[PDB]
């Protein structure tokens, strides 16, 4: 009773695999946020009435979210720290690890609650992406390739679009895409301040 649901990643990451830099997002993309908050925040129609989406997210991801964008609005957040103690916060869940916050939430959202869970996203940290990686319930992966090699100092764990990981690992279609996401999605590369970017959907089978 914890390992119903499959996990989803997303993330944007450069054609290096940088993800982060100086605790920020080396990059500024309206556009791609706004992606990112649609994804995350997508339930459908007659489940949305009831139903919401999950966050999960590394510490220092909380802390590089700017304060007023946190929580996360309209999805559930649970930050993972390895330190559960005095952090605040308008109604904020911690977990010590991956499967400790699918604990607490089966937990506090079971049939019994009036809030269900829909999809559960893990949205970073590469310590925390490095962890959903080796999950035996994540298998999905939303990513933004960002076509320039952008000075990172933080990089996504495994590279799950190169060679030596593509019998695992499989690019979808792009209807597919945005079946999943529910939604028509911009196909191919999108231009927003000096760089081009595209989205990607990845999965492997459990
Ligand atoms: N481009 C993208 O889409 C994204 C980029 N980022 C970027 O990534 C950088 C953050 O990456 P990273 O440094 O890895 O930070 P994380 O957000 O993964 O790390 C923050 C902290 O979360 C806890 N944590 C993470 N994994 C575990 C685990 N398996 N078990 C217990 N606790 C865990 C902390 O433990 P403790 O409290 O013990 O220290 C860890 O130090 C920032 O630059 C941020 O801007 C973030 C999201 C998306
Ligand atoms: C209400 C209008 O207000 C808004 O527009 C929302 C504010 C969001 O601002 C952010 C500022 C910095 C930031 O660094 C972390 C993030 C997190 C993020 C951003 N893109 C992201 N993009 C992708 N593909 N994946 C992610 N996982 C991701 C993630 C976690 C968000
Ligand atoms: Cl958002």
Redesign the pocket.
Known sequence: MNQQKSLTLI???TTSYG???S???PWKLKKEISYFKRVTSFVPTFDSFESMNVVL?????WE?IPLQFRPLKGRINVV????ESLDLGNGIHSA???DHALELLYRTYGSESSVQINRIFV???????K?AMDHPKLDRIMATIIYKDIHCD?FFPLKFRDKEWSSVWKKEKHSDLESWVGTKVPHGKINEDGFDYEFEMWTRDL
């Open positions: 993330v944007a990451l993800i982060g830099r605790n920020s997002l997210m590394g510490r220092k991801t590089s993972i720290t390895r330190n010590k690890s991956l949205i970073g940290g590469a310590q925390l992406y962890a933080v």
